């Protein structure tokens, strides 16, 4: 077995393997890859997403969200708090001032240490979740806009067409803006790219020990857990790394930089944050291992999940016991 300790694996594709996108993530599960839940790939050097950032200033946060802690320092819970609009250029400022910039620190460990003593008494503001693209349309590898499409997956493996579309979106992020522990909508694969700014540092739990981060988020967050039978999904639970370790929770961190890329691999569990100003983008895909993970993703109900209009039809085709009930919480 390939990677049996689940470390995330680092890729340096040359220029030729960048080209045949499906091709080079099945080559990176062949290595053991997604046994971490988490890769890193660097691009070769010949590549670009776009020639300059110069001109994004304009682009429009129509609902920034502060993100405000409960609980203890290792253990807590985020809501957000929509504000006012803001352009990607007040954004930044607001990310460089002395309320919100990265304080002094020698390295990426120390600022890690400052992360998880300090975050819960801070609010950053987030501009996740923003609809397009920053990606040159002459970019022809690994565009994160000319994917395809998780629908025409499910389509060429299963025969079935359904509605849907699928498009990436971007996240302006600050110092302290935190991404709570979560899988991806119906266990799918996400990629991730660094475009400009800071770093971002990254936990993940190995798949096939996804369900031991569950028993402890259960244990940690109880009256969630009561609430909600996957709890997760709401994606405001945060643990540290000292409290997974006290615990027994096996897991992996690394640090992308700008320029390079992250897959989540199906139900590799995540979180993390930003080190100062940033913008990534990113997107959902699918493969054709994805479809079993897709056929056994735990669903919320409640009614706090509320995901996208494509959603509907995973669930319908994949898990047809569970259509009704979760849809009532999309209701
Ligand atoms: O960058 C973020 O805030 C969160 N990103 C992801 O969870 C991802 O790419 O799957
Ligand atoms: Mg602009
Ligand atoms: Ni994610
Ligand atoms: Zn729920």
Same mark, same amino acid.
């Given at each position: 077995?390939?990677?049996?300790?689940?470390?995330?694996?680092?890729?340096?594709?040359?220029?030729?393997?960048?080209?045949?996108?499906?091709?080079?993530?099945?080559?990176?599960?062949?290595?053991?890859?997604?046994?971490?839940?988490?890769?890193?790939?660097?691009? *070769?050097?010949? +590549?670009?997403?776009?020639?300059?950032? #110069?001109?994004?200033?304009?682009?429009?946060?129509?609902?920034?969200?502060?993100?405000?802690?409960?609980?203890?320092?290792?253990?807590?819970?985020?809501?957000?708090?929509?504000?006012?609009?803001?352009?990607?250029?007040?954004?930044?400022?607001?990310? /460089?001032?002395?309320?919100?910039?990265?304080?002094?620190?020698?390295?990426?460990?120390?600022?890690?240490?400052?992360? +998880?003593?300090?975050?819960?008494?801070?609010? *950053?503001?987030?501009?996740? #979740?923003?609809?397009?693209?920053?990606?040159?349309?002459?970019?022809?590898?690994? /565009?994160?806009?000319?994917?395809?499409?998780?629908?025409?997956?499910?389509?060429?493996?299963?025969?079935?067409?359904?509605?849907?579309?699928?498009?990436?979106?971007?996240?302006?992020?600050?110092?302290?803006?935190?991404?709570?522990?979560?899988?991806?909508?119906?266990?799918?694969?996400?990629?991730?790219?660094?475009?400009?700014?800071?770093?971002?540092? +990254?936990?993940?739990?190995?798949?096939?020990?996804?369900?031991?981060?569950?028993?402890?988020?259960?244990?940690?967050?109880?009256?969630?857990?009561?609430?909600?039978?996957?709890?997760?999904?709401?994606?405001?639970?945060?643990?540290?790394?000292?409290?997974?370790?006290?615990?027994?929770?096996?897991?992996?961190?690394?640090?992308?930089?700008?320029?390079?890329?992250?897959?989540?691999?199906?139900?590799?569990?995540?979180?993390?944050?930003?080190?100062?100003?940033?913008?990534?983008?990113?997107?959902?895909?699918?493969?054709?291992?994805?479809?079993?993970?897709?056929?056994?993703?735990?669903?919320?109900?409640?009614?706090?999940?509320?995901?996208?209009?494509?959603? #509907?039809?995973?669930?319908?085709?994949?898990?047809?016991?569970?259509?009704?009930?979760?849809?009532?919480?999309? #209701?």
């Amino acid at each position: 077995a390939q990677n049996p300790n689940c470390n995330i694996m680092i890729f340096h594709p040359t220029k030729e393997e960048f080209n045949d996108f499906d091709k080079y993530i099945a080559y990176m599960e062949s290595q053991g890859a997604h046994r971490a839940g988490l890769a890193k790939i660097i691009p *070769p050097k010949e +590549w670009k997403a776009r020639e300059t950032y #110069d001109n994004i200033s304009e682009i429009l946060i129509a609902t920034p969200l502060q993100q405000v802690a409960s609980g203890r320092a290792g253990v807590f819970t985020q809501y957000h708090k929509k504000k006012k609009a803001m352009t990607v250029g007040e954004y930044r400022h607001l990310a /460089n001032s002395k309320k919100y910039q990265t304080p002094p620190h020698q390295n990426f460990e120390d600022l890690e240490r400052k992360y +998880w003593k300090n975050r819960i008494y801070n609010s *950053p503001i987030y501009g996740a #979740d923003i609809s397009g693209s920053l990606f040159d349309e002459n970019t022809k590898q690994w /565009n994160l806009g000319h994917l395809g499409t998780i629908q025409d997956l499910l389509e060429k493996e299963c025969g079935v067409v359904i509605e849907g579309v699928n498009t990436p979106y971007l996240y302006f992020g600050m110092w302290k803006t935190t991404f709570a522990w979560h899988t991806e909508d119906m266990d799918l694969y996400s990629i991730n790219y660094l475009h400009l700014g800071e770093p971002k540092t +990254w936990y993940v739990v190995p798949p096939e020990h996804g369900q031991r981060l569950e028993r402890l988020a259960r244990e940690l967050f109880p009256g969630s857990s009561r609430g909600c039978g996957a709890f997760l999904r709401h994606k405001v639970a945060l643990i540290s790394p000292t409290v997974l370790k006290e615990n027994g929770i096996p897991f992996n961190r690394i640090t992308q930089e700008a320029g390079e890329f992250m897959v989540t691999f199906p139900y590799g569990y995540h979180a993390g944050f930003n080190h100062g100003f940033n913008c990534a983008e990113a997107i959902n895909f699918a493969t054709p291992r994805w479809i079993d993970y897709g056929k056994m993703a735990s669903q919320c109900s409640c009614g706090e999940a509320r995901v996208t209009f494509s959603m #509907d039809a995973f669930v319908r085709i994949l898990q047809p016991e569970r259509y009704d009930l979760w849809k009532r919480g999309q #209701d």
